[PDB]
Amino acid sequence: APPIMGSSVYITVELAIAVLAILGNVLVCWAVWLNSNLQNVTNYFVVSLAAADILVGVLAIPFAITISTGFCAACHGCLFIACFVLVLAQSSIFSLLAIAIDRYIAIAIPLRYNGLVTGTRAAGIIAICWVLSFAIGLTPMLGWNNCGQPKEGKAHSQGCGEGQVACLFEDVVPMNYMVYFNFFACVLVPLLLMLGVYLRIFAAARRQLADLEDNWETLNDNLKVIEKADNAAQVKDALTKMRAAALDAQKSPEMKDFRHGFDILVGQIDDALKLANEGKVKEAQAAAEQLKTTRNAYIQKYLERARSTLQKEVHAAKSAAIIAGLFALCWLPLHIINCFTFFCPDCSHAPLWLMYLAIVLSHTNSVVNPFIYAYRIREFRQTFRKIIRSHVL
Numbered sequence: 555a556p557p558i559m560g561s562s563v564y565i566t567v568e569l570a571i572a573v574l575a576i577l578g579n580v581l582v583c584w585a586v587w588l589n590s591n592l593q594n595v596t597n598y599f600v601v602s603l604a605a606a607d608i609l610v611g612v613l614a615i616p617f618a619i620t621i622s623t624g625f626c627a628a629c630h631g632c633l634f635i636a637c638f639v640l641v642l643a644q645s646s647i648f649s650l651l652a653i654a655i656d657r658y659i660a661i662a663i664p665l666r667y668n669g670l671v672t673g674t675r676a677a678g679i680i681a682i683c684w685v686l687s688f689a690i691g692l693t694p695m696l697g698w699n700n701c702g703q704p705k706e707g708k709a710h711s712q713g714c715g716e717g718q719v720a721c722l723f724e725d726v727v728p729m730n731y732m733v734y735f736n737f738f739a740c741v742l743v744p745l746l747l748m749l750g751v752y753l754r755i756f757a758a759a760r761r762q763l764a765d766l767e768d769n770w771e772t773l774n775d776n777l778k779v780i781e782k783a784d785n786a787a788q789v790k791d792a793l794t795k796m797r798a799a800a801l802d803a804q805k806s807p808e809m810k811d812f813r814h815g816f817d818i819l820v821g822q823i824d825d826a827l828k829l830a831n832e833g834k835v836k837e838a839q840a841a842a843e844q845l846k847t848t849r850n851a852y853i854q855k856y857l858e859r860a861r862s863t864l865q866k867e868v869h870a871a872k873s874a875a876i877i878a879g880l881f882a883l884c885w886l887p888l889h890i891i892n893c894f895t896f897f898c899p900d901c902s903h904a905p906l907w908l909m910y911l912a913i914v915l916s917h918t919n920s921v922v923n924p925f926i927y928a929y930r931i932r933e934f935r936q937t938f939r940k941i942i943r944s945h946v947l
């Protein structure tokens with residue numbers, strides 16, 4: 555069948571993908587620019603991500619279309635249009651790796667997060683990572699290429715000029731770079747680091763929610779113990795434990811009542827302890843019952859406001875992990891095909907239709923991030939609606 559027929563489907567699909575990558579990711583950047591609530595360090599790596607996805611539809615996809623033709627070109631010039639998408643894919647990994655780290659710092663040390671993780675530093679890291687993306691993505695241009703052994707039978711068959719080659723990806727980029735350097739070192743290892751960072755985010759979250767439920771139990775159980783105690787020493791024991799678990803939880807209009815609610819609580823425990831150390835066992839049990847009023851007015855509201863925040867931090871970590879995981883679902887096929895081309899020379903090269911299919915799959919990854927934000931993030935969804943209603947409609 556004529557090559558232009560199959561090539562037309564691939565090109566139409568690529569262009570259709572390009573439009574969707576530019577539209578959806580320009581919509582993300584427009585939301586982060588307008589909504590002040592969306593302006594945080596975590597969302598500055600999202601804009602770096604969206605920028606990389608914008609450049610895929612504007613440059614990487616046009617470049618991919620160009621190299622599918624095998625047009626005659628200067629080898630190093632063809633080497634650039636073959637390696638530019640590696641820069642964009644490398645930038646996406648750095649951002650994906652920074653979001654995972656930023657979400658870990660947020661849940662592992664929320665108190666020193668505002669000073670440690672600032673916007674000006676996020677900008678310096680984004681700039682640093684973008685430069686390194688060009689260094690890593692264009693390494694073949696520094697010498698690790700196949701321009702020293704061009705297929706001159708292929709170049710002559712296509713009427714190429716002196717110093718030109720038939721611009722094909724696997725003919726100018728060595729496969730040991732794509733497998734050992736790009737896939738294993740620069741794509742796989744970083745994705746494994748993310749997997750481990752997300753394992754520690756969720757581990758730190760399950761632990762903290764449980765430890766807050768342990769204090770909530772240690773208080774009420776010690777209150778029940780006092781309501782059934784018999785002497786002043788028992789009461790003094792159940793209060794010594796409660797004071798430890800109270801100050802332990804202490805560690806805005808809401809933070810003012812949160813600090814007042816614990817002053818009352820810890821103070822009321824001091825009230826009962828003095829009586830327990832004075833031999834008054836009845837007056838101590840009565841003073842401890844006033845904690846039941848502080849509990850149903852301050853403590854139970856704090857426990858639930860802290861439980862909700864930990865849940866909101868887990869929801870966001872999951873949303874971030876769905877973005878890095880879908881990056882693997884889209885890029886692993888094309889990487890796994892390169893491994894078969896590289897590791898098994900006795901295997902038939904994957905057919906051209908599977909290459910196209912794997913190539914367009916890697917490009918659909920630049921369309922899906924705006925959908926995860928709109929689906930899994932309430933603030934992004936609302937801001938997308940505002941832009942669509944006010945400007946696009």
Ligand SMILES: CC(C)CCC[C@@H](C)[C@H]1CC[C@H]2[C@@H]3CC=C4C[C@@H](O)CC[C@]4(C)[C@H]3CC[C@]12C
Pocket residue numbers: 626627628630631632634635
């Ligand atoms: C700011 C952005 C939009 C500029 C984009 C410039 C791009 C399209 C330019 C920059 C370098 C250019 C390449 C450099 C060298 C060659 C070798 C020549 O034998 C074939 C064209 C080719 C392969 C060029 C194609 C177009 C190219 C990739």
Ligand SMILES: CC(C)CCC[C@@H](C)[C@H]1CC[C@H]2[C@@H]3CC=C4C[C@@H](O)CC[C@]4(C)[C@H]3CC[C@]12C
Pocket residue numbers: 883886887888890891894901902903904905908
């Ligand atoms: C969710 C993702 C990671 C699963 C996708 C795995 C895909 C890319 C794997 C599964 C089976 C693989 C194929 C199995 C057999 C062959 C025949 C061989 O002569 C060329 C490679 C080729 C054609 C493989 C290419 C890659 C392949 C299609």
Ligand SMILES: CC(C)CCC[C@@H](C)[C@H]1CC[C@H]2[C@@H]3CC=C4C[C@@H](O)CC[C@]4(C)[C@H]3CC[C@]12C
Pocket residue numbers: 742890893894897898
């Ligand atoms: C941990 C996961 C997500 C990373 C991906 C695993 C990759 C590296 C694995 C999965 C399947 C593997 C391939 C399975 C079969 C073959 C055929 C063999 O003759 C050469 C090695 C080769 C080509 C393997 C290379 C490595 C491979 C591509």
Ligand SMILES: CCCCC#Cc1nc(N)c2nc(-c3cccs3)n([C@@H]3OC[C@@H](O)[C@H]3O)c2n1
Pocket residue numbers: 617618619621622623636639640643722723724885888889892906909910913916
């Ligand atoms: C098969 C169609 C003919 C032209 C081609 C090709 C081709 N063959 C590959 N073996 C290949 N491997 C990659 C990868 C880059 C980063 C990770 S995997 N690419 C790039 O990904 C989209 C393609 O258009 C190209 O830009 C590849 N292209």
Ligand SMILES: CCCCCCCC/C=C\CCCCCCCC(=O)OC[C@H](O)CO
Pocket residue numbers: 907
């Ligand atoms: C295709 C079914 C319709 C749904 C569309 C989505 C699925 C597209 C997936 C693969 C298309 C490529 C199929 C494989 C084409 C192989 C061509 C072939 O058999 O080789 C030519 C042979 O040399 C001469 O007979």
Ligand SMILES: CCCCCCCC/C=C\CCCCCCCC(=O)O
Pocket residue numbers: 611612613616619620623625
């Ligand atoms: C708006 C920013 C995006 C600009 C992209 C411009 C659209 C170009 C799309 C595909 C270009 C592919 C050209 C193929 C080159 C080979 C042609 C030939 O061999 O004669």
Ligand SMILES: CCCCCCCC/C=C\CCCCCCCC(=O)O
Pocket residue numbers: 628629630631632634717
């Ligand atoms: C805004 C920054 C502008 C710089 C953009 C980079 C443009 C040049 C990119 C790659 C240079 C490769 C072209 C060299 C021709 C190939 C030489 C050869 O094969 O003999």
Ligand SMILES: CCCCCCCC/C=C\CCCCCCCC(=O)O
Pocket residue numbers: 630685688689692695
């Ligand atoms: C590091 C961030 C800025 C990088 C922007 C991209 C500029 C181009 C980078 C490398 C170009 C190397 C290829 C130069 C062509 C040389 C051709 C030859 O030697 O025959």
Ligand SMILES: CCCCCCCC/C=C\CCCCCCCC(=O)O
Pocket residue numbers: 651690735739740741743744747
């Ligand atoms: C072959 C050299 C290319 C440079 C490597 C590119 C891939 C980056 C992989 C790991 C970088 C590690 C530093 C980034 C932060 C993650 C560290 C961590 O696990 O906490």
